[PDB]
Amino acid sequence: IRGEEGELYGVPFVDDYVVNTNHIEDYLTRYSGILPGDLDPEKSTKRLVRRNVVYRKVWLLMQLGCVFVGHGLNNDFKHININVPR
């Protein structure tokens, strides 16, 4: 979401669910609260894949000087496998 003050202050530009191919063990609804929303005909979302689209998006926002506020982001970036600098 756009953390900058403006007309889209806090308005998302990404709310994307995962195009996941194989079987997923845990839904982790106590940790994530997914529907599961990772259905392709039952999207109810922009069910979008990382493969060069949104990984490029976050990578470019890393690249351009757009700092990433939020909570507990360190291990999040680890499980992403992005290495956001200091």
Added chain:
RNA sequence: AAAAAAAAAAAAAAAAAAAAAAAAAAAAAAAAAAAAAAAAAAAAAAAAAAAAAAAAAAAAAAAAAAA
């Protein structure tokens, strides 16, 4: 006229040198002189002389998530 075979098997043979009382020399200070198997027989590995071994390297984490 003491005048002997002139060398197998790589045969085989020389030395390449001394107490010197020559003249009026006492009784081991040597540094130690020191042989036995063979009835189926003697039998260290680790790396081998402590002539001076202080020998607990602090700890504390109230706990996660990730709605």
